[PDB]
Symmetry: D2
Subunit: 409 residues, 4 copies
């Protein structure tokens, strides 16, 4: 049959945004994880949405669960180009499962055959059409995408065990002592929060869930386990649909929970061969295309040139000489003279005063680094002034600088 | 008063093109962007781009970056196909439907910032049927321009188009009073003039402007009255970018520490096609050494492996491989610079593939043989030139 | 000094938006939603920076702004921000602005234009900005004479020879009359122009005071007046209208009768409100709809139409449509008599229906042979019937009567 | 293979060719169908070869310039027999880097799922696939006629033969080419390069390239029913060329009938066009205060009708109809102004016509034929020049 082209059209994807899980702030001091700046020009949610477009699912519902203005604004500036008459749109649904139930009437209006539940706070490339094919072929009422993960990390994920037909036999949510994969147990088998539902089953099921007082109203914590025990939950190996230029590589998926994970994932793009390919013309990522002037590199006050090693400089940046290494500079970052920026991620509109030395850190949006501030060299002092991760990564939010008496306007 | 904002709404701007208007400039722009942008910032949201010839790149640029208007709100960018006035006469039927009280004739092949609303005020206040924007230019060059002589009330006493003996200004002999090819017309008067003129040159300057002057209905508009500039204590910025040297000079100006042209002005922004590009990527060379950048621009999508980039402007997606020394150069989009190249005082055209170890800008004679070399010493490198030398473009 | 061109660009407009669909998001005139007017005015006045403050985050309002008012290129200093508000006797009008005060400060505007997005009118805010500056006021309030009987609902003001506000009172029970004509009062239109800095300071001061109700009219305007910094702006100075002689058009549309009246107004031969004015157009969501399709009824008979509007996607089998407005995708089956009615989108009228002086809500399914508008007592039982005689029919009402809505 | 969806994404559509920019069905322009088909088939990369024709460029600009180029979707305006036009721009087309090329004619009205034709193309392993439809033998001479074997491989092709070969399945019909081709991109490029580079052919697919492919045995046929989209499966495939005036009039009026052959309400295969902001269709009283009558007719946005009688008619956007008018089996294109007391029958009024007061059309056959063009079958066409020679002022 010609089902592959048909299934996306019969499907609707819902992206559960909101639920901030990041220390980073975006100019009002309380951002949501889905709207976190990434890779110089992107926000995390862009990935999920982008996948939908490239997968053939042009009907999306972004659920923003705390009236966030930066996420709504991003959807409005970068994802409001659709012609509703062509069966394509990005609806902004107001306020994990509870939010979906709250908008259940509006969703039924979509009149969708299959529903794609996604988490808009992960960075990955996946062809959802393949997962829909697997859904129909395997014929479950619910299909869940899964992948092997290190045992140490498995506590944050939902762990599952399947049979020969990839039918979900056992599921447990963020267990403290996660089961290892039965065979080749170098790591437990974690779920990716990516679901495909037959629309009718999901509607009925959410109706059932809202009336239970004791249910936690979460897919992983309450809903999915109930789905699993009835034997209607099948598994989808992520490699079956994961999109990647180099076939001989591990599937790329980052939940970007910790500061260290964020710092690592961003700096990856500055390396010679990044694990994540952001140049792939066959699976592009859509975002708000801000009009920015070219990156401007100028001489410092001493008239010296600037040096750069394995770094990214987004539009609107202005760099006076200085040395920038293993760093990612988002849009409109100003770096004044005699700076040493080092293994750092500077979010948009950061202003770095002269004679600064930044190292293994993440400067938050619009921070104003005063003149001659040093970061990343004295562990105790840095931990005192700002936040320092267990591995040694520093986070500098503009509020932290305010507490130290440095005006950020 | 209410006149100031309402005059723009009753006006329509026509941008005559040719392709020069579709020339890359400043890393992310095309020249026409300025003219159009001025209109937007001046309150004129109804534009008519007359393409001398249907240029695929110009039509495409207008389609990708300037086709965002809601026609029901009295805003549009019409693509009108086509002497200079003859092109307007051809689309005269379409233009009448605009139902504009005033028509703004612009040249889409110049780089400048001008508030056309001020020129409209000056036009109405003076009550002329036609107003011409004028700026002093060196007398030596005035032969290329249309020159004018005015009275105390900025009324044009005399006009001559491209005169062999350009008149000097009575009170500033070093230069003359030049017309900028920027006009404001009473729409109905323009219609009458075009109808009468077709039944006859077919150029505004050579034919129409002298006729209007003879009727005493042609007034002048000093450019400083409306020119937009960050530093008031400076000469008005207007570059025709005709010659290679002018193009190279204007582009590299944007790379200097203090450019004469402010491309960071949020009060008079320039609209263009907002390309979706990855950040400019700097990487290590084959030796693992760092790269050096001095007073240069690096647009999105570029990938630069170490090397030294000085006094240069790199447009989008320019690839610069290891061990390169680029100095006072302008690299247009999609240029591919092979390893170990040394480019100096040159302009590399779109998508050139520079092979490995080519040197340019050091041996004048050799450069002149391979490519085009201006009298002042600037080199231009096209895809065709490179094919003549046997270097595959693919 | 070429002020008119500059002031809008230095200004930002704030549109305050207070069962399911919110008042600013009420369908109107076949294709529009009320808020469209306010926004449109801003656009036509030169103010391309707007902030829609939604007290109740209506999915239909956000969705409408998303489909029809998210076409701006932010790099040119133009946008429509969706500002949420998180919710005493008087609704806290100012509180909603106070909540988003940080974002608004980020605009860095010299002047702020406060608007009510639940009124239908055409006004050139640039004229009010010029007058604002000329008077040198810190606050200018748009004012219009209104019938005194109704004036109790409005905020009433008394001005001097220089249009400076001398006295202000919100919703007086015993409304003061105007000196010239005491059958009218001088009412505030809930349209303000503020010096940005002054507004910021005033909101900061107001949020601290517990006594204040955080409403523009009851507390803020009196405070400004007592300082002698509140000037008035005659609406005719800026009201935009095709016919210079007619009276300024401004409709509150709170009452059901007001909605029915305003909608039906567009169906008359000469409506008071000109929706064909190419010089002051109204922007809205341009839905792709097929042309209005008129077909024969089951008997093969023609349809009759008198002073009515038929929006795109409608399908009418014969029937008689009089003094009515049919929104998009309305199906009217055979042998129907529609009279002085307003049918919101996707209404389905079964065969042999007779509707009169009524309002059918979105997507209602009228069964076959239902009569409305003729038996006052029965209509009042079945649905909602206003004191003046107008009927409203919602999907739920038809549900309770045993008629499937699906 | 596993997933068919990828074939469209690997393809680019080229729409050749004033005809494509003709108003149809009240709101659409003909080209809208082709383009729309591409969209609904998964082909979001189109190249419209124009000329320039201002109306076509403008339509593409207002209604088909909403694409995000970074997502591999666009409708670029390519300027320029038929194959020569593609050859002119094949530098740009090669830049597309498409695996398959879909050549379409933008002057036909039809609904077709090109993805199914791509499947058939690959499955048959053809270098070129030509969409084929039975046509009446009398009419088949204007078309390119072909003869195939059991495997739908094209055995014989002839362009516009005067003596069309008959077909076995329906002697009353022959096998006609629909001017819809699917090519392996590289192969197509090779054929164009060699033809412009060497052969002195007419540079037409049917006259030159299709025959060349057939003699090579690399040209297969694709039955239109395999991909034609229609709500009623038990119905005949819809495909109208609209060259003749009568065809235009008929196709337009079909949409006003109770059950149109062409479904313009299909939410599963919608047609995109320029969505102009128009006020609702306004019906008002005539000068006598009397009602208006309507029978099986369409009234687009912006129209204003004062009473009058409108029967079996299509009124495009912003048509003004004054009092005491009787319009019957007529198609009035946008912005027409009909004076008081007119009676129009079986005609097509062109854009922005101003019909003076009391003019009658469609009744006195001779009189109408005298005034302006009248087809042999009895349809009248009214153009603004026609009225100017009759002395009625336009441009008001």
């Amino acid at each position: 049959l010609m089902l592959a082209r048909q299934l996306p059209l019969k499907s609707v994807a819902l992206i559960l945004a909101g639920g901030r899980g990041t220390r980073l702030k975006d100019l009002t001091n309380k951002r949501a994880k889905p709207a976190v700046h990434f890779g110089g020009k992107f926000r995390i949610i862009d990935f999920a949405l982008s996948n939908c477009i490239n997968s053939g699912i042009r009907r999306m519902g972004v659920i923003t669960q705390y009236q966030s203005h930066t996420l709504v604004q991003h959807i409005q500036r970068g994802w409001s180009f659709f012609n509703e008459e062509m069966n394509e749109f990005v609806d902004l649904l107001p306020a994990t499962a509870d939010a979906v139930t709250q908008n259940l009437d509006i969703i039924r209006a979509y009149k969708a055959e299959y529903v794609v539940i996604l988490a808009g706070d992960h960075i990955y490339k996946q062809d959802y059409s393949r997962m829909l094919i697997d859904h129909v072929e395997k014929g479950a009422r619910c299909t869940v995408a899964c992948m092997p993960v290190p045992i140490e990390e498995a506590s944050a994920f939902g762990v599952m065990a399947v049979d020969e037909n990839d039918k979900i036999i056992e599921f447990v949510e963020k267990p403290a002592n996660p089961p290892s994969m039965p065979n080749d147990p170098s790591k437990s088998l974690a779920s990716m929060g990516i679901y495909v539902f037959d629309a009718d089953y999901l509607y009925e099921l959410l109706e059932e869930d809202d009336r239970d007082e004791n249910s936690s109203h979460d897919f992983g914590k309450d809903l999915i386990p109930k789905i699993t025990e009835a034997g209607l939950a099948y598994a989808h190996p992520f490699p079956l649909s994961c999109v990647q230029s180099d076939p001989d590589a591990e599937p790329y998926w980052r939940d970007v929970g910790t500061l260290e994970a964020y710092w690592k994932a961003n700096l990856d793009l500055a390396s010679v061969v990044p694990e994540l390919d952001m140049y792939d013309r066959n699976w592009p990522i859509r975002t708000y295309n801000e009009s920015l002037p070219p990156a401007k590199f100028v001489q410092d006050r001493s008239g010296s040139h600037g040096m750069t090693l394995n770094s990214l400089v987004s539009g609107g940046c202005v760099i006076s000489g200085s040395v920038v290494v293993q760093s990612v500079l988002f849009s409109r970052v100003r770096v004044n003279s005699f700076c040493n920026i080092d293994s750092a991620v500077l979010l948009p509109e950061v202003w770095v005063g002269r004679s600064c030395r930044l190292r293994r850190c993440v400067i938050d949006r619009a921070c104003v680094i005063p003149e001659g501030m040093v970061i990343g060299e004295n562990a105790e002092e840095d931990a005192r002034r700002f936040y320092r991760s267990e591995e040694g990564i520093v986070l500098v939010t503009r509020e932290m600088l305010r507490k130290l008496g440095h005006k950020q306007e």
